[PDB]
Each structure stands twice: as C-alpha cells, then as structure tokens.
DNA sequence: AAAAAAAAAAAAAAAAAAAAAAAAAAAAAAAAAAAAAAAAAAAAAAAAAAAAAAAAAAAAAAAAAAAAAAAAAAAAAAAAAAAAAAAAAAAAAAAAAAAAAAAAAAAAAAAAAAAAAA
C-alpha cells in the first residue's frame, strides 16, 4: 500500500518512521524527479516486518 | 317455439383529438479534441561490491517527574422503547415468435350472348 503522501518542495528534508523502531533522514534533492505509472526508488533497507 | 341481447329512433348528461404558424428551451444522439493506457526502441541511476571508519547502545548511579492510592464530584455512554431509510425476494408483464383463418390472383372449360356468312 502507500504508507503516507505529503506535498513538499525542493530541498526539504523528509523523515520516515518504521513500525519496528526506525527513523531516517535523506535530503529530498538526492532522489530523482519521478513520473507517473513508473516504478519506485529504494529508501530504507528495512529487514523483516 | 321460449329466452336473451343488439340496434335504432330523439331529447338529455358528460367528455376526447389531429394539424398551422415563430421562438425559446430541453433531451438525445452524433464528430472530434484531448488525455490515459499500452507496445516497442535506447538509454542511465541504483545495487552491488569492497575497504575503511567512528557515533550511539552498554554500563555506573543520582534524582526528579511520575502512576497507583485516596477522595470528591460531574455526568459521557449503554441498553430499552419507538420511529424512519433503504435494499433483496418474489411475482407480474408487453413485445414477440408461433400457429391458424380469410382475401386476391389464377387460369380450364362452358353458358349465354353478339355478330356475321351464304
């Protein structure tokens, strides 16, 4: 499913919150400007559940 | 031959419908822009991979915000009565293929008629 969707601008740092006690931060500018009906880019090597 | 029902006479009661003409709106059906979606090419950011590293969980231990106990008091929510909204179950139906009865064309042949020959 889709975890959550927020509307953001360039150079705004985004954080994740795993349900197995994890939190990460990657500048949003690192990742390429995606398009519709495409695949996805990995973010977090979240092992297990 | 008995019963029953239609129809027609004439003064009464009471209804219904088709078109023309112009100008505006409202349904309802089409081409045609316009953008999702999908197939098939090259192309390029991410995982891999490896070495190298140093930032946050352990551990000692005080102490300061805490969650249970006690009490008083306010009053949200739950279950029982009624009263509405909204959806499957079941039954019905109007066109619609199937069948049966009557109108128009057909010629074979003859009765009666009209006409003319010698």
UniProtKB/Swiss-Prot annotation:
It comes from the Bacteria. It is found in: Cytoplasm. Heterotetramer, composed of two GyrA and two GyrB chains. In the heterotetramer, GyrA contains the active site tyrosine that forms a transient covalent intermediate with the DNA, while GyrB binds cofactors and catalyzes ATP hydrolysis. Can form a 2:2 complex with toxin CcdB in which GyrA is inactive; rejuvenation of GyrA(2)CcdB(2) is effected by CcdA. An N-terminal fragment (residues 1-523) can be reconstituted with GyrB, but the complex no longer has negative supercoiling or ATP-independent DNA relaxation activities, although it is capable of DNA cleavage; ATP-dependent relaxation is inhibited by novobiocin and non-hydrolyzable ATP analogs. The fragment has ATP-dependent DNA relaxation and 30-fold improved decatenation activities, unlike holoenzyme it preferentially binds supercoiled DNA. When the enzyme transiently cleaves DNA a phosphotyrosine bond is formed between GyrA and DNA. In the presence of quinolones this intermediate can be trapped and is used as an indicator of drug toxicity. The enzyme-DNA intermediate is also the target of a number of topoisomerase poisons, including toxin CcdB. Belongs to the type II topoisomerase GyrA/ParC subunit family. A type II topoisomerase that negatively supercoils closed circular double-stranded (ds) DNA in an ATP-dependent manner to maintain chromosomes in an underwound state. This makes better substrates for topoisomerase IV (ParC and ParE) which is the main enzyme that unlinks newly replicated chromosomes in E.coli. Gyrase catalyzes the interconversion of other topological isomers of dsDNA rings, including catenanes. Relaxes negatively supercoiled DNA in an ATP-independent manner. Negative supercoiling favors strand separation, and DNA replication, transcription, recombination and repair, all of which involve strand separation. Type II topoisomerases break and join 2 DNA strands simultaneously in an ATP-dependent manner. This is DNA gyrase subunit A. It comes from Escherichia coli (strain K12). The gene is gyrA.
């Amino acid at each position: 499913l889709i975890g959550v969707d927020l509307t953001s601008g360039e150079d705004e740092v985004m954080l994740f919150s795993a349900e197995g006690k994890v939190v990460r931060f990657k500048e949003s500018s690192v990742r390429a400007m995606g398009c519709n009906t495409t695949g996805v880019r990995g973010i977090r090597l979240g092992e297990g559940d």
